[PDB]
Amino acid sequence: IRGCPTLETPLKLTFTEDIQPRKENYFYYDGWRGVGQTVNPWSPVLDNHKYAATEHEIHIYVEFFQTPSNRFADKNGAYSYIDANGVMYTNGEYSWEHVPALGKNIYKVVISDWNKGQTKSIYLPGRDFKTVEVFHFQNNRPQWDDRNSYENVKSRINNNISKSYSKAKLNEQLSTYVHDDGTDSLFLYQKLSRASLKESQINYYQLRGKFNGVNLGYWAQEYILFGGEGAEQLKNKIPDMSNYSMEDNGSFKNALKIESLDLRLMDNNRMAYGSTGTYIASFNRTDFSMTPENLKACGLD
């Protein structure tokens, strides 16, 4: 059989900032950059600068089962190769760093300057990965300077970042005698997993956090409260629940059909009299276009 997607077809990850400011009665809240007095153009409130982030970065760590096997590089970076020294050769905007101290066949890339409205896109060096982990960092938080310590970030993911928030906590008005709300630089963790070299599906896990809080006479707190597949379809809606999980889990079957895996960050309703913002970190597949008769022929139905 000929012409099917295979493990040598490039696979893309995309990351889209899509937060629209939320108006409160008349400040505008924007999880990416704080609190504004007006929008279009944005004008921050005074002392927004003390609290809000101005930089966002994406760190991607990919672990393979074996050395990536592609033997050529293209002009714009859909294709990479590894030399005799284990260094990955990639043209274009992004370059991967070999990190053998973390383990065998692990490569790291940093995507910076993630600004309002932007989509970042990157091809993985291989579709047959073992693990992909993505760290999302915002600055003006005390952990920002140490963001390159994989071990310290993973420690906080495992031990320090809340996996659930109660309805009561979301309705709390943080006392102004708390001077720093304790938000981590890390606001989102993604993990993609494949159980074997030739696995036909992709498993995903997300741990969602918070955007920088802003204290303008009273605390505004910003929770990435929802996420995962299809979560973007539930915009403008905070379901009433006793507890709100900060974890997403799922699996994409027939992964060879997938062209890209897409993260989208968006605003949702605010609550607690405007003090609590909620956001959605949806994670979805974009499939190649295929007919039913090519899906069946390729074993992807």
DSSP sequence for 141-185: STTGGGTT-HHHHHHHHHHTS-SEEEHHHHT----TT-SS----S
Classify burial at 221, counting beta carbons within 10 Å of its beta carbon; exposed 0-12, middle 13-18, buried 19 or more. buried
Q: Give the residue among 29, 111, 3 at the shortest CA–CA distance from 279.
A: 29
As for the chain, the residues directly before each break of C–N over 2.5 Å are: 25
Residues belonging to the chain = 301
88-97 own/partner pairs: CB under 8 Å, 24+ apart: 88/125, 90/125, 94/122, 96/62, 96/125
Quick check: 96 and 110 in contact, CB under 8 A? no
Quick check: 26 and 274 in contact, CB under 8 A? no
| Distance in angstroms between the alpha carbons of the first and the last residue of the chain | 16
Rounded to an integer, what is the distance from CA 14 to the centroid of its chain?
A: 9
Quick check: 136 and 188 in contact, CB under 8 A? yes
Would strands 81-82 and 88-89 be described as parallel, antiparallel, or unpaired?
antiparallel
Tokens standing for 225? 């409260």
| H-run or E-run covering 130 | strand 129-138
Residues 6+ apart with CB under 8 A from 182: none
- The sign of the dihedral angle between the CA atoms of 118, 123, 128, 134 is negative
Determination method here?
X-ray
Quick check: 211 and 31 in contact, CB under 8 A? yes
Residue 41: asked if its preceding bond is cis (omega within 30°), the reply is yes
How far, in Å, CA of 100 to CA of 88, rounded?
12
- The sign of the dihedral angle between the CA atoms of 265, 270, 272, 273 is positive
Phi-psi region of 105 (alpha: psi -120 to 50; beta: other; left: phi over 0): left
- The conformation of residue 28, written as its DSSP 8-state character, comes to E
How far, in Å, CA of 198 to CA of 102, rounded?
23
113 annotated ligand binder:
yes
Rounded to an integer, what is the distance from CA 37 to the centroid of its chain?
A: 28
